[PDB]
Design a protein around this ligand. Structure first.
Ligand SMILES: *[C@@H]1O[C@H](CO)[C@@H](O[C@@H]2O[C@H](CO)[C@@H](O[C@@H]3O[C@H](CO)[C@@H](O)[C@H](O)[C@@H]3O)[C@H](O)[C@H]2NC(C)=O)[C@H](O)[C@H]1NC(C)=O
Lengths: 50, 48
C-alpha cells in the first residue's frame, strides 16, 4: 500500500501484529524485522475548483 | 437603552465578547454544541 510512515505511540501488546481503526483500515503495522511500531497515513489529496 | 420601561438586555447584542451574540443565543449555541464541535475545518494537519 501507499502512505506516509511515521513514528507511532500505539501501546501494542506482544501478541498484537496489525493495527486497525474505526472502519477496517490498517493505520499501524509491526515490522517483520527488528521490532518497531509504525503508523500508516495516506499522503495529501483534495479537490480543484476553477 | 430605555424603551418605555421594557427590558431588552437579554436579546440585544453586547460588545463585551469576541462574538457579538445575545445571552439567549449563547445559551442556544452551548446547548446545541453537545455534538457540533468547534473544529478548525479539519485541515490536512490531521496526521497526529
Ligand atoms: C434587564 O434584565 C437584566 C437581566 O435579565 C438585568 O441585569 C441583571 O441585573 C442584576 C442586578 O443589577 C444582576 O444581578 C447581580 O449580578 C451580579 C453579577 O456580578 C452579582 O454580583 C449580584 O449579586 C447580583 O446577582 C444580574 O447579574 C444582571 N444580569 C445580567 C445578565 O447581567 C438588568 O438590570 C435589567 N435592566 C434594568 C434596567 O434593570
Amino acid at each position: 500500500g501507499t502512505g506516509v510512515l511515521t513514528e507511532s505511540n500505539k501501546k501494542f501488546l506482544p501478541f498484537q501484529q496489525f493495527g486497525r481503526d474505526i472502519a477496517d483500515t490498517t493505520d499501524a503495522v509491526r515490522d517483520p524485522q527488528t521490532l518497531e511500531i509504525l503508523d500508516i497515513t495516506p499522503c495529501s489529496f483534495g479537490g480543484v475548483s476553477v | 437603552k430605555y424603551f418605555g420601561g421594557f427590558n431588552f438586555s437579554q436579546i440585544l447584542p453586547d460588545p463585551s465578547k469576541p462574538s457579538k451574540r445575545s445571552f439567549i443565543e449563547d445559551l442556544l449555541f452551548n446547548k446545541v454544541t453537545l455534538a457540533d464541535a468547534g473544529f478548525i475545518k479539519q485541515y490536512g494537519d490531521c496526521l497526529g
